[PDB]
Structure formats: C-alpha cells, structure tokens
Design an enzyme around this catalytic site. Structure first.
Site, PDB file in Angstrom:
ATOM      1  N   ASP A 136      63.265  68.782  -9.427  1.00 12.94           N
ATOM      2  CA  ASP A 136      62.567  70.033  -9.226  1.00 12.94           C
ATOM      3  C   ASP A 136      61.957  70.606 -10.517  1.00 12.94           C
ATOM      4  O   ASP A 136      62.484  71.572 -11.071  1.00 12.94           O
ATOM      5  CB  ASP A 136      63.648  70.974  -8.635  1.00 12.94           C
ATOM      6  CG  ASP A 136      63.134  72.333  -8.181  1.00 12.94           C
ATOM      7  OD1 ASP A 136      61.901  72.567  -8.111  1.00 12.94           O
ATOM      8  OD2 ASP A 136      64.007  73.201  -7.888  1.00 12.94           O
ATOM      9  N   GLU A 190      56.207  78.199 -10.678  1.00 20.49           N
ATOM     10  CA  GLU A 190      56.442  78.075  -9.268  1.00 20.49           C
ATOM     11  C   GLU A 190      57.733  78.850  -8.904  1.00 20.49           C
ATOM     12  O   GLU A 190      57.812  79.467  -7.822  1.00 20.49           O
ATOM     13  CB  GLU A 190      56.656  76.625  -8.914  1.00 20.49           C
ATOM     14  CG  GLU A 190      56.770  76.358  -7.400  1.00 20.49           C
ATOM     15  CD  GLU A 190      58.280  76.201  -6.928  1.00 20.49           C
ATOM     16  OE1 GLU A 190      59.199  76.356  -7.716  1.00 20.49           O
ATOM     17  OE2 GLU A 190      58.522  75.903  -5.743  1.00 20.49           O
ATOM     18  N   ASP A 216      57.381  67.810  -4.338  1.00 20.34           N
ATOM     19  CA  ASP A 216      58.427  68.691  -4.913  1.00 20.34           C
ATOM     20  C   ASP A 216      59.801  68.179  -4.376  1.00 20.34           C
ATOM     21  O   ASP A 216      59.903  67.589  -3.311  1.00 20.34           O
ATOM     22  CB  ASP A 216      58.217  70.170  -4.478  1.00 20.34           C
ATOM     23  CG  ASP A 216      58.888  71.167  -5.421  1.00 20.34           C
ATOM     24  OD1 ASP A 216      59.570  70.750  -6.363  1.00 20.34           O
ATOM     25  OD2 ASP A 216      58.740  72.411  -5.198  1.00 20.34           O
ATOM     26  N   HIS A 236      68.860  73.595  -7.086  1.00 16.92           N
ATOM     27  CA  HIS A 236      69.118  74.813  -7.848  1.00 16.92           C
ATOM     28  C   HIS A 236      70.518  74.921  -8.392  1.00 16.92           C
ATOM     29  O   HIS A 236      71.066  76.041  -8.491  1.00 16.92           O
ATOM     30  CB  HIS A 236      68.735  76.051  -7.047  1.00 16.92           C
ATOM     31  CG  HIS A 236      67.234  76.196  -6.923  1.00 16.92           C
ATOM     32  ND1 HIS A 236      66.622  77.319  -6.405  1.00 16.92           N
ATOM     33  CD2 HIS A 236      66.234  75.354  -7.283  1.00 16.92           C
ATOM     34  CE1 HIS A 236      65.300  77.159  -6.453  1.00 16.92           C
ATOM     35  NE2 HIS A 236      65.052  75.977  -6.985  1.00 16.92           N
TER      36      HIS A 236
HETATM   37 ZN   LIG Z   1      63.263  74.986  -7.464  1.00 16.53          ZN
END
Ligand SMILES: [Zn+2]
Length: 323
Positions: free
Chosen positions: A127, A163, A210, A292
């Site tokens: 990411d 982003e 992504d 994340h």
């Molecule tokens: Zn992200």
C-alpha cells in the site's frame, strides 16, 4: 465536431500469440524489480516527509534512465488538512503528451502517516510500494516496445501523492492528490488548442493498482463500463496459466474472478470516476490481512504472485496499445 473521445468505446486489443506471450513472460524480472524498484521505496514516505522527497526522486530517476521518451511532470499544490495547509506533489510520466488518447496506469506513492510504535515504522509495502514498483518494472520491461511510440493513443503513468487520510478516512481528509489532479485535468484543454475537450476526455481508461502484494488476491469486476477490459485480464491470466508461464498458480485460485462488488471503495479513482472516466480498479477484496498495520512489510509480500501480476499487466498494456 470530432467524435474522437468516443473511440475508447470501440477500441479493441491486438491480442498476443503464444510466442509473444512467452517473450513477455521471460522479459520481466521480479528479482530486478525487487532490488532496483521496490526496496528503495520501502521507507516512511508520508506527504511532506524526507521520505516523500526520496521516493519521488527514485521514481523520476528510474523513469529517466529508460530509452522511451517519457515526459516527467511534478504536479505540486496546497491543500487544507487536519494539520493545516500542506504541500503535495503528484508525479505524472507521459509518452506522447500531445497524443489525444492515453491508457493510464496509476497508484499512490505516499505511505500512511503513523508515529513510530515500539520502533516499528509503517512502510505500506502492498500500500502501495509494490504497485509503484510494478509500474516502474513495466516501464523498464516494455521499454524497447514503448520506444517505438516516439490510433492516436499512448501511455501515461500517474503516482499520486496524499491518497491516505492523515487521521482516519473522511471526505476532506484523503485523496488529496487525486482530487486535485482530476479537477486540474478536467479543466485542461486537450489536445493543445482544443475548444471543448479536456485531458479527462483523453483518458481512455484509468487502471488503478492498490494493495497488491499479499497472497491469494481476488480482484472483483467493479464497473460495467470497464467490464470488457476486466474480462481481458481474465483471459490473459488464463492463457498465461495454460502456457505454463505463471508460478505457483491455479485456476481455482485465480486472481480475476467472476464476481462483482456493488459497494464503493474509497481510493484515487473516485475523483475520476465521478467525472466520467472509465476505471479498472485493481484492488483486491478483501484487503490484505496486513492492511494499515506495521506488518504491511517486505516479509509479508508474496513474490510469485507479484511476478504473475507483472506478466498479466504487461501483456494487458501491450495488447491495449497494439504493441
Ligand atoms: Zn492505505
């Protein structure tokens, strides 16, 4: 009144035969991408940080060394953020800037901001360091073919800044670089001198990569107006698989499956999609388990899957461009 912006609706690929597919499979190198394109990006690179600057220099340098006639532009702007006004820099790399139409591959090169935690730093490997490296490897692997472009149609790469939300996602805190660039492209005549068409009309298709790099990704067919290109990715994957050109891969575990997803996923394609640009969103659903977290790192990437996807993407791009 030219109907050129309608050409993308009828555009068909020039499909590669088996010998050409073997050539593409053999012409990309996952270990070179890993060392030369990916590892330098596995650093903290949130907007405005020293790492952001280093990532941008790395991306520009890797493109500049290629033979094809890439024109690099840095799109720098200000935006309000939860931390006040900040500066962002999108990277745009274009072959044949005055060409009316471009196939556009994109990803984001910023990493999500996280204060260091127990000495761990977030580097956002899937990411989206891997997607950035895949775009750089494609430019390198297809360089001789792309040099031939020096169908008024060419290729553009966009690496978006900002982003990620600085906090958790909200409409105003996220997609900084793409909201800005979509509005700039929508208000920029194209080709130069045009009276009523913009750079967005020239975007044939926006292929946004992504969250790529984890094992067993499954990409859904999100949008009906790009579904026929999603089907092309399925066919390419199937043929490369049947030719024995993919690694550790089975059709039951294929990446492009027959299944849609009606919900909305927030990503850089949104500002483009809402202005009428066809989008092929190559993001898996579900997201990588490491999404994340500090475990979105090099160790958790799946090398052969990234290699397989590089092959599929490169074939897709050559077929779209008739190269
Ligand atoms: Zn992200």
């Amino acid at each position: 009144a030219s109907a050129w912006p309608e050409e993308k609706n009828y555009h068909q690929p020039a499909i590669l035969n088996s010998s050409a597919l073997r050539q593409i499979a053999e012409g990309t190198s996952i270990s070179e991408m890993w060392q030369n394109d990916l590892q330098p990006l596995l650093i903290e690179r949130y907007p405005g940080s020293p790492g952001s600057y280093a990532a941008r220099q790395h991306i520009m340098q890797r493109i500049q060394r290629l033979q094809a006639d890439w024109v690099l532009e840095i799109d720098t702007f200000l935006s309000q953020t939860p931390y006040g006004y900040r500066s962002f820099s999108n990277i745009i790399s274009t072959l044949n800037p005055t060409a009316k139409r471009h196939l556009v591959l994109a990803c984001h090169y910023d990493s999500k901001y996280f204060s260091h935690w127990n000495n761990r730093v977030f580097v956002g490997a899937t990411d989206a360091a891997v997607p950035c490296a895949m775009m750089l490897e494609l430019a390198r692997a297809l360089d001789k073919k792309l040099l031939s472009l020096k169908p008024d149609l060419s290729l553009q790469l966009i690496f978006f800044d900002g982003e990620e939300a600085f906090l958790h996602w909200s409409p105003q805190d996220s997609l900084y670089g793409s909201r800005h660039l979509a509005a700039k492209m929508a208000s920029t005549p194209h080709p130069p001198g045009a009276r009523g068409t913009s750079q967005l009309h020239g975007m044939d298709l926006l292929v946004l990569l992504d969250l790529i790099g984890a094992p067993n990704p499954t990409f859904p067919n999100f949008f009906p107006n790009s579904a026929r290109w999603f089907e092309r990715l399925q066919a390419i994957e199937h043929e490369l698989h049947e030719l024995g050109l993919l690694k550790d891969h089975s059709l039951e575990g294929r990446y492009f499956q027959n299944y849609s997803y009606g919900g909305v996923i927030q990503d850089d394609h949104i500002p483009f999609l809402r202005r009428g640009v066809p989008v092929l969103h190559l993001i898996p659903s579900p997201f990588p388990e490491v999404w994340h977290t500090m475990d979105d790192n090099e160790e958790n990437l799946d090398e052969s899957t990234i290699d397989n996807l590089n092959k599929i993407l490169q074939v897709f791009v050559l077929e779209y461009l008739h190269l």
